[PDB]
Amino acid sequence: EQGDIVVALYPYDGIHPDDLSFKKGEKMKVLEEHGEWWKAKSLLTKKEGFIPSNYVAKLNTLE
């Protein structure tokens, strides 16, 4: 859901300006879920952009 903290499982290089580029282990805040791609904010760079949702996992997976 919106505001959840996620961690990158694999790195990803954005191909377009609206994408975030991240490394494995990078922490991001999910802003909006839009199917396969989510809008997120890198907690390291504070930059926002779309990320492939299959490349991240919730830091909280139990609840």
Residue numbers in the entry: 63 to 125
Copy text verbatim from the article accompanying this structure deposition.
Lyn kinase (Lck/Yes related novel protein tyrosine kinase) is a Src-family kinase organized into four domains. These include an N-terminal unique domain (also known as SH4 domain), two adapter domains (SH3 and SH2) and C-terminal kinase domain (also known as SH1 domain). In the inactive state, the SH3 domain binds to the linker between the SH2 domain and the kinase domain, keeping the kinase in a closed (inactive) conformation. SH2 and SH3 adapter domains regulate the interactions of Lyn kinase with substrates and may help confer substrate specificity.
Here, we determined the structure of the Lyn SH3 domain to 1.3 Å resolution using X-ray crystallography, which allowed up to propose how cancer-associated point mutations affect this domain. The crystal structure of the Lyn SH3 domain contains five β-strands organized into two β-sheets. Previously termed β1 –β5, these β-strands are connected via four loops termed the RT loop, n-src loop, distal loop, and 310 helical loop. The largest differences in position involve the residues that are found within the polyproline binding cleft, G76, H78 and P79 of the RT loop and E98, E99 of n-src loop, which exhibit positional differences of 1.5 Å – 2.3 Å due to rotation of these loop elements. Conformational changes in these two loops are observed in the NMR structure bound to the herpesvirus-derived peptide. Flexibility of the RT and n-src loops has previously been suggested as important for interaction with polyproline motifs, which might proceed via an induced fit mechanism. Analysis of whole genomes revealed 18 cancer-associated point mutations within the Lyn SH3 domain, affecting ~30% of the residues in this domain. Evaluation of the locations of these mutations in the context of the structure suggests that many of the likely transformative substitutions could prevent the interaction of the SH3 domain with the kinase domain, but by distinct mechanisms. For example, a subset of the mutations, including D81N, W99L and E98K, may disrupt the protein-protein interaction interface with the kinase domain, and eliminate negative regulation of kinase activity. Other mutations, such as V118M, may destabilize the fold of the SH3 domain, again preventing the normal attenuation of kinase activity in the basal state of Lyn.
